[PDB]
Structure formats: C-alpha cells, structure tokens
Amino acid sequence: STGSATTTPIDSLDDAYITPVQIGTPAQTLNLDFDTGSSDLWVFSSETTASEVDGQTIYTPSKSTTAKLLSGATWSISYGDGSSSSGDVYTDTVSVGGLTVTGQAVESAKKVSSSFTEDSTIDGLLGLAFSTLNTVSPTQQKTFFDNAKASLDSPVFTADLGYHAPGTYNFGFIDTTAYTGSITYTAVSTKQGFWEWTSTGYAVGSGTFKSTSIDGIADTGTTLLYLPATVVSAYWAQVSGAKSSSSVGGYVFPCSATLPSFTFGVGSARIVIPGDYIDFGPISTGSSSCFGGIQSSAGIGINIFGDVALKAAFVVFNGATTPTLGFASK
C-alpha cells in the first residue's frame, strides 16, 4: 500500500505545516502537525478542557463506531519549546492520504498548554520519530508509520515541504518526479529515538565549504534551523546589522537586508537553503527588526534540522531494518 497527502503552511511564515488526517468511522478529519521529532499521535478532543479549546477541530470518540478506550492508558508529553499536553488513549482507524491503519493509538488530550490553545490551525500532532519515544503508559504505543510499515510497498516516508506553498508527505514510495538529481543517503542513529544524522559541513552564501561534522536531527515539527553557535555566528556575520538579542531570544537582522544562502552537506552532496527561507519577518508587527531562521542550538543540547532546512530538500525517511535518511535537491 501507499499514501499521499498534501501538507500546507499554517501561516505566511511557514511556522508549521498541517496535513489532513481521517480518524474514526465515519471519518473525522483533523489537521495534524506531522512531527518527525516526536512519537505521539495526539488530538484535541471532546475530552479537552473547554477553556483550552479555541477554534480547533476536535475528535469525538463517542461518535466513532471503531473507537475503543485503551483501558488504563495515559500519556503526557513536553516539547522542546516548553509546550505540553496530556490525556488518555483510544484505538481507532486512522487514514493519511489513502493509507489506512486499524488499531492506531489516538491520544486524546484532556489538557494542552497555552501555545496549543492559541494556535487555532493545529488540531494535534502525528509523531513520526521512533516508537521508543512514545509516551503512552503503562503500555507504549507505536507510531502511525510503525503500524503501517509492513503493509507499505517500501518501508519509507518522504517529506517534501514547500516554501510559502503546499508540499507533500508520501508513505510507501519515492516519487522520482519530485526532486532533481540523485538522492544522497546518510546513516541514522536511533539511540535517542530521533532521525539523527551527521551533516558533513556548511557554507555561507558563495563562501567556501567548511568540512565539519554536525550531528543533528531531521525534525519536521521544528520551524527553524538550530546549529552550533560557531556556525550560526559565521552566518549572521555576513548580514550587516545582524545581532543576537537576548531580549528577543535570538538573532535578529535589519528587515532591509538581503540574506545570503546557507548550504549544508549530506555526504559529498550539498543542499542549498536560499536566503529568503531564513527570513521570519518582523519581530513584532511594524518593526524593522526581523527574526532569523538560523539560530543557535546552544542550550538545546542538540542540533535541529527543522523546516528551514528540510523545505530546501526532498527528504526520505527510510525505515528499513537499518534506518537511513536521504536528501535530494528539488
């Protein structure tokens, strides 16, 4: 089997992407944030504290003839940005882009943090990291991908995120029309439960490529590109007037600037992030200070190849017995 679904930016900055997901019988369609940095499929629901729901579409398990309470199971997750959610668990039928999993754990939120409430466009998350990170207790549950894997034509999914435009998540096949040149594959460590890999270096603009190993995670659920302070300083030093602002929480730059591109290495191959992808706009409405899309990972504890990086590529998440990651230009 295969599946193919369009993923759409939630706003004009590509802060996140939502993908429609069918849950239950009859189908209830919710727009979920597909997150290769976590492993829980959780939704706003009829059980979510009323004051914490503000515009989201909710899953109502009592209206699904295939929903079953997973007795005694609870979940609770905290994300790298300090947001969180928790609740109980149902199993139900879940379909993405024509691909159906029966008996998928659907984690129903009883509580969500303010960042989730305040984002009316995101109805929940669909985790696509390794199932070892799943938070359901006392019986850990499998991701949608893990459940689908054996049925898929090939045990893979791909992320093709757009810049200020829709893109695609495919399951079970590689669309050879969706990228240019060849796909370069690179080793993955699953030791921390992430799609963790090692970039071979970087360049700033038209500058020379610096060969250096950068361990990090391919994370569709993180907006920006978080890299070591040395690398990030070298990038912003090429933008007149750019500076790190402790008050704002990162590098800012004059909105009048033209940003250089940023290249990252994948083996001997190179992925080029155009300068415009690194512009996250005014820090506040009407400001002439703009927020940068490349930020320091210092104090995160891990480098994160988030959407800024991934949207410059066609990315293969290969879930074969020994997982790997593939990147192609597009």
Side-chain angles (χ1 to χ4, degrees), residues 16-17 38 65 91 105 129 145 159 216 231 234 257 273 276 318:
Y17 297 77
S38 69
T65 59
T91 55
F145 179 53
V231 177
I273 306 172
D276 291 345
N318 170 26

Side-chain angles (χ1 to χ4, degrees), residues 198-242 244-319:
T198 302
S199 173
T200 49
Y202 70 98
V204 176
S206 61
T208 61
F209 186 86
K210 176 71 169 182
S211 293
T212 185
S213 292
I214 305 171
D215 296 339
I217 66 167
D219 186 0
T220 58
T222 291
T223 312
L224 306 185
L225 173 53
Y226 294 89
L227 292 173
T230 48
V231 177
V232 175
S233 183
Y235 178 80
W236 289 108
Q238 297 305 309
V239 180
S240 298
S244 183
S245 168
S246 54
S247 56
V248 173
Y251 281 90
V252 297
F253 68 93
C255 293
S256 61
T258 301
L259 296 177
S261 64
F262 184 90
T263 301
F264 65 93
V266 182
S268 57
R270 306 289 180 253
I271 299 295
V272 180
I273 306 172
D276 291 345
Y277 290 26
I278 298 160
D279 177 18
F280 280 75
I283 60 169
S284 290
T285 301
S287 181
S288 70
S289 182
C290 274
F291 197 69
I294 295 177
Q295 296 294 347
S296 177
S297 65
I300 293 178
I302 198 159
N303 300 306
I304 306 174
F305 294 85
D307 298 335
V308 164
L310 303 181
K311 76 190 176 192
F314 178 87
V315 188
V316 181
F317 294 79
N318 170 26

Side-chain angles (χ1 to χ4, degrees), residues 1 7 15 32 48 66 105 118 155 182 271 290 314 325:
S1 61
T7 193
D15 282 315
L32 305 188
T48 310
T66 42
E118 294 163 0
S182 54
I271 299 295
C290 274
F314 178 87
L325 273 171

Side-chain angles (χ1 to χ4, degrees), residues 13 22 39 41 135 192 235 271:
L13 299 177
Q22 282 70 49
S39 306
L41 192 176
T135 76
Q192 291 192 90
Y235 178 80
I271 299 295

